[PDB]
Design a protein around this ligand. Structure first.
Ligand SMILES: Nc1ncnc2c1ncn2[C@@H]1O[C@H](COP(=O)(O)OP(=O)(O)O)[C@@H](O)[C@H]1O
Ligand SMILES: [Ca+2]
Ligand SMILES: [Ca+2]
Ligand SMILES: [Mg+2]
Lengths: 363, 154
């Protein structure tokens, strides 16, 4: 019996089989329907036909906000992508911390009542990333398309009082890039155009080590500019947008949020932990998720945390090259362990207890 | 946020500890562990926790990951037992091995009631406590190791 591991990102499904070193199916967590008001398309095919579709994400900031479309995503994952019968596979799902309880209750209900899985578990994403890095103690910064979360973990236990969350991540950065590209006279507005700008962001953006210096460099000459060919063949040029876009992670006021930036929040999370473990957290900051992939982000985090921390603190940022998949990989490892599976909710337990059982078994 | 309304409301509870303690009862490797002063060693082999024979204790394959339980009498009571649990990660160990070693270290900690203190020991970064476990010349690193448990997705 092989378990399935499905990391339902806000932006991307990562799905596959426990014991594999990578997800075998990775595709956009989108449902498309005709832009002019089978009748819908999912995933890669929706992307391929986006010229005629309006695209919608069933997950926003880590929370399922369209359950009917989320069911379509899961059905597509099992039957069209992995081509498995879900009633044959124990299934591991994932979630961001500090989600409302009802989210995992309904995940549990749908997995058992609709897909008839034999067993399932819902894991906290950052915990999986830490194990993927070979650690039991550290502080994870996880940032995908929907959520940026910080989870300090000591001797294998997450410290709930110190967990931080910011509903600011990759989709907000894409939207901001769409906005600031209007200054050059470009117009990216539609859901299909959002996907184009997401690609521009992934290919060309970076985090400046010193933002104000970089702004001056960008005005002094064209040395930082890059060109990009749109799907219609038009070639555009972008300049300081390359680093203004992800600067928002450090300065959330760029999008009108009063929140602390990702450096300050990491620091604040460490400072909520007992003093005697802080050195181990500062030396073990593990980054996971696609929004941690900007070139320069680890060096900027190192610089900013250094400025906040005591002057003698040893600080290290760990940025695994495969960190777009670290959550999934940690799930593949843990779901390969019989003792971890012993904790999973069985179909019989669900039949007798209902959705509330998820809170008594999944930690 | 409001932790009590959230999916982390039960983290840090006695219930969390109880569920994990029960899971740790399902690993044969821990049966009989930590019953007398000494050093017990296991190696991860394709996700499984496999004992290392005593004659090999202190020799570690650079391609592998291990769990080392050191049982000792604490200063507070010469007749009872305390524990340091070290997980040793070879320079060439694969990600499945190191992740399993980490998870199973926590599980052995759970099995022993939370008493062990955990130490992550990467080859070349071993703590003073880890270096002190083996007699003079006793710490030896060996070439190679067992094959990963992962299937490689092409
Ligand atoms: N190289 C990159 N630079 C910046 N952002 C990236 C990069 N690669 C992916 N992303 C962003 O990361 C997000 C997808 O990452 P992922 O961790 O799978 O998110 P999720 O788990 O929420 O689906 C999207 O916002 C995507 O645009
Ligand atoms: Ca090995
Ligand atoms: Ca302990
Ligand atoms: Mg994610």
């Amino acid at each position: 019996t092989t378990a399935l591991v499905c990391d339902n990102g806000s932006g991307l499904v990562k799905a596959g089989f426990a014991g594999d070193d990578a997800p075998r199916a990775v595709f956009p967590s989108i449902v498309g329907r005709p832009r002019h008001q089978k009748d819908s398309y999912v995933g890669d095919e929706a992307q391929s036909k986006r010229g005629i579709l309006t695209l919608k994400y069933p997950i926003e900031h880590g929370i399922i906000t369209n359950w009917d479309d989320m069911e379509k995503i899961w059905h597509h994952t099992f039957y069209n992508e992995l081509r498995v019968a879900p009633e044959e596979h124990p299934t591991l799902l994932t979630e961001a911390p500090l989600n409302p309880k009802a989210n995992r209750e309904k995940m549990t209900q749908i997995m058992f009542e609709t897909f008839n899985v034999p067993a399932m578990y819902v894991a906290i994403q950052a915990v999986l990333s830490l194990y993927a890095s070979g650690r039991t103690t550290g502080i994870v910064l996880d940032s995908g398309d929907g959520v940026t979360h910080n989870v300090p973990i000591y001797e294998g236990y997450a410290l709930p009082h110190a967990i931080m969350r910011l509903d600011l991540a990759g989709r907000d950065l894409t939207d901001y890039l769409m906005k600031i590209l209007t200054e050059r006279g470009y117009s990216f507005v539609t859901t299909a155009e959002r996907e184009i700008v997401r690609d521009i962001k992934e290919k060309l953006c970076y985090v400046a080590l010193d933002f104000e210096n970089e702004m001056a460099t960008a005005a002094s000459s064209s040395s930082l500019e890059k060109s990009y060919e749109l799907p219609d063949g038009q070639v555009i040029t972008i300049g300081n947008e390359r680093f203004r876009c992800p600067e928002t992670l450090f300065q959330p006021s760029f999008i009108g949020m009063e929140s602390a930036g990702i450096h300050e929040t990491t620091y604040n999370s460490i400072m909520k932990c007992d003093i005697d473990i802080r050195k181990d957290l500062y030396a073990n900051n593990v980054m996971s998720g696609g929004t941690t992939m900007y070139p320069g982000i680890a060096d900027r985090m190192q610089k900013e945390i250094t400025a906040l921390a005591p002057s003698t603190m040893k600080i290290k940022i760990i940025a695994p090259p495969e960190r777009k998949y670290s959550v999934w990989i940690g799930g593949s490892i843990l779901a390969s362990l019989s003792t971890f599976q012993q904790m999973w909710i069985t179909k019989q337990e669900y039949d007798e207890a209902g959705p509330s059982i998820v809170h008594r078994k999944c930690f | 946020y409001n932790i009590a309304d959230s999916n982390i409301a039960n983290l840090g509870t006695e219930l969390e500890k109880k569920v994990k303690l029960e899971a740790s009862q399902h690993e044969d490797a821990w049966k009989g562990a930590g019953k007398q002063v000494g050093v017990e060693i296991w190696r991860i082999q394709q996700f499984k926790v496999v004992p290392v024979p005593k004659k090999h204790h202190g020799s570690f394959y650079t391609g592998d990951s291990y769990i080392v339980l050191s049982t000792y009498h604490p200063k507070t009571n010469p007749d009872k037992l305390a524990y340091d649990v070290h997980f040793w990660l070879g320079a060439f160990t694969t990600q499945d091995e190191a992740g399993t070693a980490a998870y199973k270290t926590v599980e052995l900690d759970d099995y022993l009631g939370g008493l062990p203190v955990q130490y992550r020991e990467v080859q070349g970064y071993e703590s003073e406590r880890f270096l002190s476990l083996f007699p003079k010349g006793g710490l030896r690193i060996l070439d190679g190791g067992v094959e990963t448990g992962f299937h490689h997705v092409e």
